[PDB]
């Protein structure tokens, strides 16, 4: 049986350049997956201030940490909101809403990833944005599927 978490980790790491920072991110991801005690606020502040990572990468990681910690009332973060929002283009948003409509009916990781791969990186990031901003809701496995598809599209373009 696929470990969702191994898979998410592999996809998210695929968009991060090699180096000490990448090793530190892998470790924090694993710590969170395994339930090792963690202040989400502290982790998000650490993430926000890392050099090297592009804003989109920080947004994707912030989304992953927020979804995986047992509990947040931490308000959603502006640095994630700005990275996932698109540049306010109605066409990406329109496509993000169309993908959301489909993801809302899904409950499995594989179903979610497959459907998500029909959309561009921009539409995928905005769909992540919809979810992060509480505009739409999906199950955790479906959110992970979307994350992986987003990373796969980013990795393939690079």
Q: Which chain residues interact with a second copy by CB under 8 A? A: 73, 75-78, 81-82, 85-86, 88, 90, 93-94, 97-98, 100-101, 104, 126, 129-130, 133-137
**Under 8 Å between Cβ of 87 and 101:** no
Question: After which residues does the chain break, using C–N > 2.5 Å?
Answer: 72
Distances (CA, A) of 100 to 37, 115, 137, 148: 32, 10, 9, 15
Question: Smallest gap, in angstroms, from Cβ of residue 33 to a second copy?
Answer: 25
Q: Which does 97 bind (CB under 5 to 8 A by kind): a second copy, Cl ion, none?
A: a second copy
Stretch near Cl ion under the rule CB under 5 A, chosen from 9-17, 76-84, 117-125, 130-138:
76-84
For residue 42 the two structure tokens come to: 């502290």
Residues in contact with Cl ion by CB under 5 A are 77-79, 89-91
């Amino acid at each position: 049986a696929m470990s969702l978490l191994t898979e998410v980790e592999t996809y998210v790491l695929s968009i991060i350049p090699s180096g000490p920072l990448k090793a530190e991110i892998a470790q924090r991801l694993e710590d969170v997956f395994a339930g090792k005690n963690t202040d989400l606020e502290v982790l998000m502040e650490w993430l926000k201030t890392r050099p090297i990572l592009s804003p989109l990468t920080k947004g994707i990681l912030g989304f992953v940490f927020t979804l995986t910690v047992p509990s947040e009332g931490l308000q959603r973060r502006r640095f994630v909101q700005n990275a996932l929002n698109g540049n306010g283009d109605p066409n990406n948003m329109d496509k993000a809403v169309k993908l959301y409509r489909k993801l809302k009916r899904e409950i499995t990781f594989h179903g979610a990833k497959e459907i998500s791969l029909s959309y561009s990186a921009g539409a995928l990031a905005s769909c992540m944005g919809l979810i992060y901003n509480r505009m739409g809701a999906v199950t955790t496995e479906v959110a992970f599927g979307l994350v992986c598809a987003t990373c796969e599209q980013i990795a393939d373009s690079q």
